[PDB]
Write a protein that binds this ligand. Structure first.
Ligand SMILES: Nc1ncnc2c1ncn2[C@@H]1O[C@H](COP(=O)(O)OP(=O)(O)O)[C@@H](O)[C@H]1O
Ligand SMILES: [Ca+2]
Lengths: 68, 375, 464, 68
């Protein structure tokens, strides 16, 4: 029974390190993507503000055209 | 509870039986609308099998069960088994007697006339219901999301329904029905799975296909550009350890099946895509009533939860649709329970009195009372 | 009651002094200045006097109905909220204000900015504070306890001062909610000491799963502005209702007598009759309370007492009495009714207050005691107002508010995440689960208001 | 020695369960964020075209106004 206990201890201790290792890598991958996600989110919003202006200017030009 | 008396909310479909207590905002005890016997003859003595195995008890152990579904989108293969589904609903989970509280069921748009009278027979004559109504699927969700002017396309596993309801229901047809959802995607997988040394043969494990489906499978934005990407084994294959023990590296399998949604030509049906049928319903209404429909589109149902479902619509619609005003689709991040949130609405309305059927009303107008007052 | 009652006990003539010294005390809590009347209290209080085995008081409890909980953040220009608040900000020292998290700048806030008035010549601010302290100390609230309570109130102030800005998350014209003034929302989580972000993940976004077990919070829905500001109010307002109830009750814990038990006698006290040249939603609910008070007597001095005629054994013959005015009762109870159709229009989320008006006219304009400018040709009625009869006169109401003013309901998807903390203040806001008032927690407003009014009636048809 | 090994095995499996749980929540967090990042990326690209179109149509309107 001792041999079995030692055997399970080996595979458990090893899998424990792998599980912890994966947890760090997964969190590591989460961080790099989260940062990029925030940068994109911010960039997207700035464009939406410019998008509205670009349209209003385009419409204003059309209304200004109709007058002339 | 020293508040009122006799009240409850319910809703059933081809996935879950959504129901709760009186005056609730969200369901309380949802369970799969399944039911089967024993292909294993259940230790015949370690109980006189019977109870087909419905409810959590059924979903727990699938192996012994030969899950034979009763109501496949519209058609009810058998009503005899329905008897002991509602016997499990009101009495076990809801813990209330149907001979007291009303009931608000859902209606599959354009359901056979003979079915309505049959259902009423099970409630009024047997379960004694002095008040109940069977509202029409989609229209319910409209009042929940807070929309009065939009087009609703509510569908999950049951049947697809294009309901242009933004200022009137029951009028010109402008509605469609398509038996292509849920179980259709659940049965199609095992076919194509054969080419990858996998085969969910019987119906019991077929139900699991749906479980894994709703946790990874996504829709392709453009099949052409993602065909060459297949070489890059990174965005495709993903290790999914089957609970028992059999890894399935789903990759191209994820965006191949959902393609059938927009392309019903992969299963021998001339039925046009959900974005074509949308046109079919819009072209019927007046000309000066489209600009507001495009502004807001109500896409509801658990089918509208997969990655790449709303963005694709805004690509195909704009093509064969007017291109001048802005187009926005309102797809509630949790648009599955949209029907239930709307159910809670009509459940607390008093005007609803001029809709449901009272005990005596049935005996005063025979069995046709349903199609004599309702519509 | 006294004198006729008993004497002897030195602790009897002393308590006969504190209850008379409760007049200045009750003149602070319930009372609040209105635009016209200064001492115009605003609350539905039903105080119960407990007694002993000889016939003298021992203690009592306090009960309140649905609160005009919008009083704290919204009101008509010129009016003011409860005094206890304004008398605190100008009574403490900047050193202590910093501990609370307050800055010497009234316009900087929002709840106080919406009013547009602070310093008043009539009422003295610094002079009242010291008097409030005496009142608290005289009863049984030492500074040590006061500070312990201020933390709870100061916490609410942090979670109050947050009217979030436009969140450019959507695409076209609509939008959701997101924090721009972070330090304000941070203050809300500061007292809670939790991840500022995670806090908004469960609130502004509605998470729901349920089924089989019971719920799993994480996936959620960015709701629209209307439902956003809705939860904003429902949250900041519900906490106060729980506080007041726990405030007055926990005070009695010290005042209440443990030496002996006895019977109970109730006393009623409510707001007054006010009529402006203009009107609004709040006028309807206040007048509704009167409709019950008038009906109360009718049920008692006209009905109950009338039954006493035949109980005393007197040759009685039924004499015509003015009808039980069920035209104003049956019209708001059973299906097809005012409050019945009111809940009907409110639940149609998109339907505004204006549309609700039309839902009344069609259903009625025939049943007595209801008119409008369409049917009744009277220029006095505006195009956005309506007529309603009560006892002996006419009152034209406005439509402003109604929506967010009424519903106010709060679900358990916003409370669960907060009561899961570990702090006598955070979880303290939510006393040991259900203070004898629950049965069923999640119910769309309408009914919730019926409870406060039904619990009132059920305890009237079984007493002398 | 068996008793000592069993004791070490008991705590080992407990740490293993905790490690796997942490990794399961981490890999899920990275997953959901990755999906959101892609959704934002597609929304950024589709708007990038609209922004340009909104700018060109504005310049064209100005040129059209100059002619008249
Ligand atoms: N977030 C989700 N992602 C994918 N599928 C989901 C999601 N939530 C629910 N579903 C699925 O949606 C189906 C239920 O959708 P529903 O619209 O209620 O169907 P029906 O009305 O046909 O009963 C079930 O198959 C369920 O697993
Ligand atoms: Ca259905």
């Amino acid at each position: 029974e001792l041999d079995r206990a030692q055997e399970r201890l080996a595979t458990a201790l090893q899998k424990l390190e792998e599980a912890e290792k994966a947890a760090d890598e997964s969190e590591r991958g989460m961080k790099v993507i989260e940062s990029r996600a925030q940068k994109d989110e911010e960039k997207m919003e700035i464009q939406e503000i410019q998008l509205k202006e670009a349209k209003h200017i385009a419409e204003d030009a059309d209304r200004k055209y109709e007058e002339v | 509870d020293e508040d009122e008396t006799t009240a409850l909310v319910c809703d059933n479909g081809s996935g879950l039986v959504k129901a709760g207590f009186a005056g609730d905002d969200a369901p309380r005890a949802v369970f799969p609308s399944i039911v089967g016997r024993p292909r294993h003859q259940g230790v015949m003595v370690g109980m006189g099998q019977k109870d087909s195995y419905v409810g959590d008890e059924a979903q727990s152990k699938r192996g012994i069960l030969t899950l034979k579904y009763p109501i496949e989108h519209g058609i009810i293969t058998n009503w005899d088994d329905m008897e002991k589904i509602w016997h499990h609903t009101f009495y076990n989970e809801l813990r209330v007697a149907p001979e007291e509280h009303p009931t608000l069921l859902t209606e599959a748009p354009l359901n056979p006339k003979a079915n309505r009278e049959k259902m009423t027979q099970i409630m009024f004559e047997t379960f004694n219901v002095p008040a109940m109504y069977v509202a029409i699927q989609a229209v319910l969700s409209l009042y929940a999301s807070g929309r009065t002017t939009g087009i609703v396309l509510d569908s999950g596993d049951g049947v697809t329904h294009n309901v242009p309801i933004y200022e009137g229901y029951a009028l010109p047809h402008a509605i469609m029905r398509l038996d292509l959802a849920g179980r259709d995607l659940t049965d199609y997988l095992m076919k194509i799975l054969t080419e990858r040394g996998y085969s969910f043969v019987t119906t019991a494990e077929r139900e699991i296909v749906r479980d894994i489906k709703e946790k990874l499978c996504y829709v392709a934005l453009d099949f052409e550009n993602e065909m060459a990407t297949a070489a890059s084994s990174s965005s495709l294959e993903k290790s999914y350890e089957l609970p028992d023990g059999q890894v399935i590296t789903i990759g191209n399998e994820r965006f191949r099946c959902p393609e059938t949604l927009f392309q019903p030509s992969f299963i021998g049906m001339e039925s046009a895509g959900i974005h074509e049928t949308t046109y079919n319903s819009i072209m019927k209404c007046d000309i000066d009533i489209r600009k507001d429909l495009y502004a807001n589109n109500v896409m509801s149902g658990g089918t509208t939860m997969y990655p790449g479902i709303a963005d694709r619509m805004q690509k195909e619609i704009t093509a064969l649709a007017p291109s001048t005003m802005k187009i926005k689709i309102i797809a509630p991040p949790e648009r599955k329970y949209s029907v239930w949130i709307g159910g809670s609405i009509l459940a607390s309305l008093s005007t609803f009195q001029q809709m449901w059927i009272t005990k005596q009303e049935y005996d005063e107008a025979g069995p046709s009372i349903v199609h004599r007052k309702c519509f | 009651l006294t004198f006729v009652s008993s004497n002897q006990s030195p602790n009897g003539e002393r308590i006969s002094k504190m209850l008379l010294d409760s007049n200045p005390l009750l003149e602070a809590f319930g009372n609040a200045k209105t635009l016209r009347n200064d001492n115009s209290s605003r609350f539905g209080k039903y105080m119960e006097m407990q007694f002993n085995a000889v016939g003298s008081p021992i203690g009592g409890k306090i009960t309140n109905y649905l609160l005009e909980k919008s009083r704290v953040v919204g009101r008509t220009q010129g009016e003011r909220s409860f005094h206890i608040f304004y008398q605190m900000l100008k009574g403490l020292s900047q050193s202590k204000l910093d501990e609370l998290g307050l800055t010497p700048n009234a316009p900087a806030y929002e709840y106080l900015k919406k009013s547009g008035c602070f310093d008043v010549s009539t009422i003295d601010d610094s002079g009242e504070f010291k008097i409030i302290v005496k009142a608290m100390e005289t009863l049984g609230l030492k500074e040590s306890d006061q500070n312990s309570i201020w933390r709870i109130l100061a916490a609410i102030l942090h979670i109050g001062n947050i009217t979030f800005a436009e969140a450019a998350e959507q695409r076209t014209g609509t939008t959701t909610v997101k924090v721009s003034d972070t330090k304000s929302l941070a203050a809300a989580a500061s007292c809670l000491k939790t991840d500022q972000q995670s806090l908004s993940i469960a609130l502004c976004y509605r998470s729901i799963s349920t089924g089989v077990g019971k719920r799993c919070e994480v996936i959620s829905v960015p709701m629209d502005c209307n439902q956003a500001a809705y939860s904003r109010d429902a949250l900041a307002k519900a906490l106060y209702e729980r506080l007041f109830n726990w405030l007055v009750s926990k005070i009695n814990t010290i005042i209440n007598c443990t030496t002996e038990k006895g019977p109970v006698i109730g006393i009623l006290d409510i707001y007054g009759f006010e009529v402006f040249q203009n009107n609004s939603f709040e006028q309807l609910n206040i007048n509704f309370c009167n409709e019950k008070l008038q009906q109360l007597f009718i049920e008692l001095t006209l009905k109950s007492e009338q039954e006493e005629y035949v109980r005393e054994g007197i040759e009685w013959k039924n004499i015509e009495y003015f009808n039980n005015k069920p035209i104003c009762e049956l019209i708001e109870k059973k299906p097809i009714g005012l409050i019945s159709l009111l809940d009907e229009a409110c639940l149609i989320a998109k339907s505004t207050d204006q549309t609700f008006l039309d839902s009344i006219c069609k259903q009625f304009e025939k049943n007595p005691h209801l008119q409008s400018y369409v049917v009744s040709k009277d220029r006095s009625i505006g195009d956005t107002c309506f007529r309603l009869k009560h006892y002996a006169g006419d009152v034209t109401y406005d439509v402003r508010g109604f929506l967010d003013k009424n519903k106010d309901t709060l679900f358990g998807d916003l409370i669960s995440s907060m009561q899961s903390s570990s702090d006598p203040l955070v979880q303290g806001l939510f006393p040991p689960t259900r203070p004898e008032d629950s049965k069923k927690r999640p119910e769309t407003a309408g009914s919730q208001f019926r409870n406060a009014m039904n619990a009132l009636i059920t305890t009237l048809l079984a007493c002398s």
